[PDB]
Amino acid sequence: NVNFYDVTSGATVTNGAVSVNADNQGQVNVANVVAAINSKYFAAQYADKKLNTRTANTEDAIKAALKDQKIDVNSVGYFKAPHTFTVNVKATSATLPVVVTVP
């Protein structure tokens, strides 16, 4: 099956969590959320005795999570973050819920 893993430790992860900084007006860019998630977690499938990486839908998943919280993102990626929200990151042959906190 597809599973998610920690990039740095290699451990299998079921639920993830990251922190992303806002600017002094409480604005965040989706690109910084995508970087926080994808730098920390990756998806892969075992085959041919190795882990094979699988592309995650992180940007789309972030925008979908914010739209479920009634938060819009503008054409160049900025939005007003909630304090914390959950992104359901998907990779295809698995879903990794990732808690995103914006202090």
Residue numbers in the entry: 199 to 291, 298 to 307
Task: Give the published text.
The SlpA protein (~46 kDa) is the main structural component of Lactobacillus acidophilus ATCC 4356 S-layer, built of two domains. The N-terminal part, exhibiting the first two domains (SlpA_I and SlpA_II), is known to be responsible for the self-assembly of the S-layer protein into a regular lattice. One basic tile is composed of the homodimer of the full-length SlpA, dimerized at the SlpA_II domain. The assembly is propagated in one direction by alternating SlpA_I dimers and SlpA_II dimers and in the other by the pore spanning N terminus of SlpA_I. The self-assembly region (SA) is formed by domains SlpA_I and SlpA_II, building a 2D crystalline network that forms the exposed surface of the SlpA layer.
